[PDB]
Amino acid sequence: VSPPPPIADEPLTVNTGIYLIECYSLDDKAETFKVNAFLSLSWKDRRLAFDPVRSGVRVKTYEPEAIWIPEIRFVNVENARDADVVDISVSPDGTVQYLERFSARVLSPLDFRRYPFDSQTLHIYLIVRSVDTRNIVLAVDLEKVGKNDDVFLTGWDIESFTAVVKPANFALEDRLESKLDYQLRISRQYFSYIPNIILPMLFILFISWTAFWSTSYEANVTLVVSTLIAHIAFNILVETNLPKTPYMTYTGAIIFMIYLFYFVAVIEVTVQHYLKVESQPARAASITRASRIAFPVVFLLANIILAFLFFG
């Protein structure tokens, strides 16, 4: 029951790693996802061993639950994980092997700075409660690095799983060596969003620019205002896909720019009508001809500037 005594005068090291089996339910609204995987642990019990038997009497000895096992916990998942022990075995000179399958609901945030073309990083953290004087300093073994189990996440793809680092944890300067970090890097598949959220809005905006080829005030007014109403309705329609956030994003900037363009178009139409009424047709014609070219060029330049600002 008791942990191995500090005979080696060196903290016990526990090599550990996880192996993914199936992950799913990565919703953007609650920043939650489910992970099912297999967790393995190793030991540094080489100086001594409670069962150092090496003869053929007990080949591949397996220990019961009475032997000591480390207790680890995930600091992100709410409630507690469900683990079922499946394999315990002790080799000569200690170094027992302990495998199990678990399930948890990790809590990791997302950064929607580049929502359609963003890359996220899901984090996994675990710690071990120290006992007596010797520490339980953890390490990582690259043989059981994980993944490689044909696991697929819909709407995303996986490029790496561990990139193992050991950041120094800090909690009121507690007596903890470090905390293990597991960073699942993913990328979004953005092709489906182009015909669904991007192109219809551009088509609606381009429809409103046909008012520069007409001289009817009523038709121009109807076109511009009804196009604004249609844009607002489309924004209501696709409000679920767009992320509600307390900071500034790319799509929000695009939408604000579209609103500004609608306002400027209304102003231009009113100015043209007023100039035509006061018997100055040449000025109105010149202004309309200039705007015909000015509007798309300014739109493209502003889009390029935003793309260079929002993506480095």
Ligand X SMILES: CCCCCCCC/C=C\CCCCCCCC(=O)OC[C@H](COP(=O)(O)OCCN)OC(=O)CCCCCCC/C=C\CCCCCCCC
Which of positions 245-274 make contact with ligand X (CB under 6 A)? 260-261, 264, 267-268, 270-271, 274
User: Which neighbouring-strand residues pair with 24?
Assistant: 34
Q: Please name the amino acid found at residue 248.
A: M
The reply on whether position 227 binds ligand X by CB under 6 A is no
CB 33 within 8 A of CB 108: yes
Stretch 178-207 residues interacting with ligand X (CB under 6 A): 206
CB 129 within 8 A of CB 135: no
295 binds, among a copy of itself, ligand X, none (CB under 5 to 8 A by kind): ligand X
- Within the chain, where are the H helices? 199-208, 217-237, 250-277, 281-309
* Joined tokens for residue 261: 């363009």
Q: Per-residue contact track with a copy of itself, 1 to 40, x per CB under 8 A? A: ------------------x-x--x-------------x--
- Residue 82 C-beta-side C-alpha neighbours within 13 Å: 5
Q: Is the dihedral of CA 95, 100, 104, 108 positive or negative?
A: positive
Q: Please name the amino acid found at residue 265.
A: A
- Residue 286 C-beta-side C-alpha neighbours within 13 Å: 5
The reply on whether position 210 binds ligand X by CB under 6 A is yes
CA dist., res. 153 & res. 7, Å (int) = 47
Cβ proximity to ligand X: between 62 and 256 the closer is 256
The one segment of 117-125, 198-206, 280-288, 301-309 that binds a copy of itself by CB under 8 A: 198-206
Cβ proximity to ligand X: between 52 and 281 the closer is 281
The reply on whether position 216 binds ligand X by CB under 6 A is no
121 binds, among ligand X, a copy of itself, none (CB under 5 to 8 A by kind): none
296 binds, among ligand X, a copy of itself, none (CB under 5 to 8 A by kind): ligand X
Q: Could you give the 3-state DSSP secondary structure of residue 184? A: strand
Q: Per-residue contact track with a copy of itself, 92 to 131, x per CB under 8 A? A: -----------x---x-x-------------------x--
Number of Cβ atoms within 10 Å of the Cβ of 235: 14
User: Which neighbouring-strand residues pair with 87?
Assistant: 99
The reply on whether position 310 binds a copy of itself by CB under 8 A is no
Residues in the chain: 312
The reply on whether position 221 binds ligand X by CB under 6 A is no
Q: Using alpha carbons only, how large is the chain's radius of gyration in Å? A: 31
CA dist., res. 304 & res. 180, Å (int) = 41
203 binds, among a copy of itself, ligand X, none (CB under 5 to 8 A by kind): a copy of itself
The one segment of 89-97, 173-181, 217-225, 298-306 that binds ligand X by CB under 6 A: 298-306
135 binds, among a copy of itself, ligand X, none (CB under 5 to 8 A by kind): none
Cα 176 from chain centroid (whole Å): 28
Among 7, 67, 83, 237, binds a copy of itself (CB under 8 A): 237
Among 69, 252, 299, 306, binds a copy of itself (CB under 8 A): 252
Residues at the interface with ligand X (CB under 6 A): 206, 209-210, 213, 260-261, 264, 267-268, 270-271, 274-275, 278, 283, 286-287, 290-291, 294-296, 298-300
